[PDB]
């Protein structure tokens, strides 16, 4: 598909659902969600299945479509 559904849960138990271009990278995803989650992109750490997502990698590489990613500040 052309786009990915990505859920983001913060430590305060808020879960938001985003729909983004399927080739979007992690740095760009942080920028996409920053206003919604009220955490500046440079202060975001994203975690999925035990691992910290790296800025230069594509979301798709982590196979997160339809899945929950956790977001922590700093």
Swiss-Prot record:
Tissues showing expression: Expressed by immature dendritic cells (at protein level).
Subcellular location as annotated: Cytoplasm, Cytosol; Nucleus; Secreted, Extracellular exosome
Post-translational modification (record): Ricin can induce a cleavage by the caspase CASP3. The released C-terminal peptide induces apoptosis.
Residue ranges annotated for the Ubiquitin-like domain, each copy included: 4-74
Record remark on domains: The ubiquitin-like domain mediates interaction with the E3 ubiquitin-protein ligase RNF126 which is responsible for the BAG6-dependent ubiquitination of client proteins. SGTA also binds this domain and competes with RNF126 to antagonize client protein ubiquitination and degradation. The ubiquitin-like domain also mediates the interaction with USP13.
Protein task: ATP-independent molecular chaperone preventing the aggregation of misfolded and hydrophobic patches-containing proteins. Functions as part of a cytosolic protein quality control complex, the BAG6/BAT3 complex, which maintains these client proteins in a soluble state and participates in their proper delivery to the endoplasmic reticulum or alternatively can promote their sorting to the proteasome where they undergo degradation. The BAG6/BAT3 complex is involved in the post-translational delivery of tail-anchored/type II transmembrane proteins to the endoplasmic reticulum membrane.
Quaternary state and interactors: Component of the BAG6/BAT3 complex, also named BAT3 complex, at least composed of BAG6, UBL4A and GET4/TRC35. Interacts with GET4; the interaction is direct and localizes BAG6 in the cytosol. Interacts with UBL4A; the interaction is direct and required for UBL4A protein stability. Interacts with AIFM1. Interacts with HSPA2. Interacts with CTCFL. Interacts with p300/EP300. Interacts (via ubiquitin-like domain) with RNF126; required for BAG6-dependent ubiquitination of proteins mislocalized to the cytosol.
Protein's name according to its UniProt entry: Large proline-rich protein BAG6
Whole-protein residues included: 14 to 87 of 1132
